[PDB]
Amino acid sequence: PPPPPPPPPGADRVVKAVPFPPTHRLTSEEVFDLDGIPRVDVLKNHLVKEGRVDEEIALRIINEGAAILRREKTMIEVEAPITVCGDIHGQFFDLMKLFEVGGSPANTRYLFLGDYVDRGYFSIECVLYLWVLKILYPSTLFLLRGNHECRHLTEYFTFKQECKIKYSERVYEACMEAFDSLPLAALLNQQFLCVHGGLSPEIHTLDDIRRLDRFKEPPAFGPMCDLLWSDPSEDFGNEKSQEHFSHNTVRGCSYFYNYPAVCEFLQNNNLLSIIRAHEAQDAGYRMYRKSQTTGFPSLITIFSAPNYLDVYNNKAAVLKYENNVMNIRQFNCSPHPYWLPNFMDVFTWSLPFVGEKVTEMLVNVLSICSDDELVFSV
């Protein structure tokens, strides 16, 4: 008779209760149907189990999404009823919950204000899943660019690394391409301007946005930078100064914008409010000072990543606009699998410690004669 087989993997797993990820990557026959349309539930279910996908499928999803996005206006027009969402930041398991609270994309309109990647250790999953939804629901699901959807930031934070480990630098490159394609802004129902960051001193009319050429890495200054980067001032609606814009000391680039700057823009353009994300909120949202003319809050912040960074312990929120009622749905964080900082494996992690400690022991052992012969952290 022949040699016995390897023992069952996980025959000796110590914590046997913990779910074990899939060992197989999804293939195109499993993801795409006869017509070349992706099957979301097959994709979602596999990603939730921490499964990966064949590289060709990653590219294909990312490129198809990019092609659709590329065609869209830089300021898209979008009408109620809709669900508007703020930063996601790689928080895939929260994104799942976001959709349970928001409703299925199959019968629910969505607008995302950007910042899908970085910080969370499931950024590529967020991207693949949103891109498939964009592919399935091109006319009811919308994605804007956030300041993290660019080379500078994803190189600096975790996302370029995430791609390198889970997929390939080729996938990271396809993502940079697709990100250059994301619309910069949305006019919602002719009343609301939606952008990730906010205003720019060089932006006075809606046309000033429509004109912009978005197909590039964002500059270190200018209108495009400011849309993705600006914040309201720390004292918005209560400022001592009447300055419209001041340099943004917190971001290190772009500007703060004052309540006067916001009123002027709303008034000149017949908008009711500005809807943006970009800044974490302990409540998942924040409604700023209401303009006198309308009694409606002149600025709204929506933040959709609960318990941001596992530390903030903040609620998340989405904004449901229907029947002329704008209603905030709050939600709490969800469990997610663990990853070592910068996606390193336990060998890469522990090997240097092993080296130190074994060498140290030996060095000590060998110093038992002084020329007579002549604690591990993440």
Binding site: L351, G355, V358, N364, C369, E373
Partner: protein, 166 residues
């Protein structure tokens, strides 16, 4: 006289003589082997979480102690004259507790457990152990061979950092 010792090491005669002096000073009961408790009587080893792993590897005949041959051959792994593959194969053996030539999920978990202590929940440790194995396992047996291990950590140059003068 006794019979000669056969052995394989990077050391010359003098180096062997020098390690011999250390060996005898360590052998407390002057018995010819080196017990675990003799190793532990060096204070600066009582809080080293890899002491038993190292002894285990040194102890090639599996009898629980370290005789002179195994002591030479063990230290030879750390000679400045040793090669990359040698220092790596040693570190591979820190993980391969049962010595069958594969690191299994459980062994990797246990040996990390020795180093990490309570700096991770067992759940977090299990999850990263799982993922590491999946990423590195190129033949789908659920464990890591020496070739797979090296493919992961060959570029890390830690072999350059495990060296002792004798």
């Amino acid at each position: 006289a006794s019979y000669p010792l056969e052995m394989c090491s990077h050391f010359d005669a003098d180096e062997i003589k020098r390690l011999g002096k250390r060996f005898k000073k360590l052998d407390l009961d002057n018995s010819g082997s080196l017990s675990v408790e003799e190793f532990m009587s060096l204070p600066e080893l009582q809080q080293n979480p890899l002491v038993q792993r190292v002894i285990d590897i040194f102890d090639t005949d599996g009898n629980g102690e370290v005789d002179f041959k195994e002591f030479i051959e063990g230290v030879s792994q750390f000679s400045v004259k040793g090669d990359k593959e040698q220092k790596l194969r040693f570190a591979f053996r820190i993980y391969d507790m049962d010595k069958d030539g594969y690191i299994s999920n459980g062994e990797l978990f246990q040996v990390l457990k020795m180093m990490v202590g309570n700096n991770l929940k067992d759940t977090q440790l299990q999850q990263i152990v799982d993922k590491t194995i999946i990423n590195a396992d190129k033949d789908g047996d659920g464990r890591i061979s020496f070739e797979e291990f090296c493919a992961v950590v060959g570029g890390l140059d830690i072999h350059k950092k495990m060296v002792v003068d004798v």
